[PDB]
């Protein structure tokens, strides 16, 4: 141990800045590839996330080739067609008009998975609450996302697709689970608020009535 | 949109410092209570996390009272011993020596929840996994975890308990689910590396072993 620790005003501002400015990026990806050194720093961030029992259940399968990004994209559509069919009248139109991935456009894609049996037979956290290993994995992702914003790299989480297909296309064991598919690529333009809000799909909720005092539903 | 690019060297360094020094703090929480202005910032960070279909499924229940922390600490006890009994040998006595919560010590606790039904009948980005909603909530948590470090606020995740027992305490309805119970409080010091690694319970896996290329198992 050592060092108390409030950051300086400048450091504090930067952290907040990464937090207040990252976005899910679908259509503004740049073709320029990321250096091996950059990717390492982004995965290095991810790897420094907390994880239940410190089992560090994650794996990152990097995807860089056209054949693969084509099969996955095909896997997206199909899934997205089904999704669309869940909305009627007006909404559907809107849904079917949104951009929900840039699988093809983005140079690098990362498939972050969770090994449901990493470590031993028992473990902390993951005792009566199995989800924790997965939750640990999502933290990994959030970290990547922020470090990415910092690096001027765009990131997009795509979740519209049958896991089995993606697992098959990547040859992932069934004892292993996909937490997230991430599209990555530099970006020079960013929405100043959630795109999904801008395109009028859903607004930002007022935090003030999402916060309770000492007991559920108590303001 | 709006023009955008990488952070400056200085800023970039700040972001990585939060990602690099935050710890699950258990036993070194300080007594002073977080000012209201501070809390709003942390909650603001979490609220600026992404969320499938921009559904924003979270709710935060602030727990500042002793009777509440007492009860929860107890729920923790029950579950933790039960957990303990899943080990044997030095490993059990080992476990039984790890401080795995600061419920009674941290001046503030936050129960981060996930409304499983918010976002209408059928939300965007979901169906090809109904847990993306929970996942989203985690991102909120991780953002809170990171901002807090910059705020010089230690945070620890406590998952060791039977959810229903915690839901009863705070009266959390059925459609909502607990994703995390976070103990917050100012710290005066941090472990330079993960504490479980310091206590020889488990080490940092070598990141190179986890990174694959194009397909599972391929290095
Ligand atoms: C777990 C999870 C999964 C997804 C998302 C998010 C999260 C948290 N998001 C991005 C989502 O739509 C986005 O967070 C909101 O629209 C607001 O984004 P930003 O505030 O700009 O990050 C998303 N976006 C998209 O275009 N296709 C997808 O399949 C998903 N899936
Ligand atoms: C989803 C999830 C859930 C838990 C944790 C983490 C995560 C990601 N951790 C914290 C964990 O023990 C910690 O990550 C490791 O000790 C090392 O990571 P740090 O870098 O120190 O945070 C944790 N710690 C603890 O004392 N009791 C608990 O119930 C849990 N549960």
Swiss-Prot record, chains A, B:
Q: Which CDD domains does this one have?
A: BluB (cd02145)
InterPro entries the UniProt entry points to: BluB, Nitroreductase, Nitroreductase-like, Nitroreductase/BluB
Q: Where does FMN bind?
A: 22-26, 51, 100, 159
> What is the activity regulation entry?
Inhibited by high concentrations of FMN.
**Record note on what altering residue 24 to A/N/S does:** Abrogates DMB formation but retains flavin binding
Q: Which SUPFAM superfamilies match?
A: FMN-dependent nitroreductase-like
What happens when you mutate residue 159 to C? Completely abolishes DMB formation
What catalytic activity does the UniProt entry give for this protein?
FMNH2 + O2 = dialurate + 5,6-dimethylbenzimidazole + D-erythrose 4-phosphate + H(+)
In the record, what terms sit under GO molecular function? 5,6-dimethylbenzimidazole synthase activity; nucleotide binding; oxidoreductase activity, acting on paired donors, with incorporation or reduction of molecular oxygen
Q: What happens when the gene is disrupted?
A: Cells lacking this gene are unable to grow in minimal media and fails to establish a symbiosis with alfalfa, and these defects can be rescued by the addition of vitamin B12 (cyanocobalamin) or the lower ligand of cobalamin, 5,6-dimethylbenzimidazole (DMB).
Q: Which family does it belong to?
A: Belongs to the BluB family.
* UniProt-listed PANTHER family: IODOTYROSINE DEIODINASE 1, NADPH NITROREDUCTASE
Subunit arrangement?
Answer: Homooctamer.
Indicate what this protein is called per its UniProt record. Answer: 5,6-dimethylbenzimidazole synthase
Species assigned in the record: Rhizobium meliloti (strain 1021)
């Amino acid at each position: 141990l050592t060092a108390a620790g409030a950051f300086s005003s400048d450091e504090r501002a930067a952290v907040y800045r990464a937090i207040e400015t990252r976005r899910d990026v679908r259509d503004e990806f740049l073709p320029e590839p990321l250096s091996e050194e950059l990717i390492a720093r982004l995965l290095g961030a991810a790897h420094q996330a907390p994880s239940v029992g410190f089992m560090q259940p994650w794996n990152f399968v990097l995807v860089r080739q056209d054949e693969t990004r084509e099969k996955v994209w095909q896997a997206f559509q199909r899934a997205n067609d089904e999704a669309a069919e869940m909305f009627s009248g007006e909404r559907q139109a809107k849904y079917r008009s949104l951009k929900l991935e840039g699988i093809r456009k983005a140079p690098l894609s990362i498939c972050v998975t969770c090994d449901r049996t990493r470590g031993g037979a028992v473990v902390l956290g993951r005792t009566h609450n199995p989800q924790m290993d997965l939750y640990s994995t999502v933290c990994a992702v959030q970290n990547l996302w922020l470090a990415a914003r910092a690096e001027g790299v765009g990131v997009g989480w795509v979740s519209i697709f049958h896991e089995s297909e993606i697992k098959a296309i990547l040859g992932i064991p069934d004892h292993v689970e996909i937490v997230a598919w991430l599209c990555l690529g530099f970006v020079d333009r960013l929405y100043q608020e959630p795109e999904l809000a801008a395109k009028g799909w859903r607004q930002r909720l007022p935090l003030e009535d999402l916060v309770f005092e000492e007991g559920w539903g108590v303001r």
